Design a protein around this ligand. Structure first.
Ligand SMILES: [Co+2]
Length: 9
């Protein structure tokens, strides 16, 4: 989640 969300952002 940490990576996924920060990539999206
Ligand atoms: Co964060």
């Amino acid at each position: 989640l940490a990576e996924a969300l920060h990539a999206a952002l």
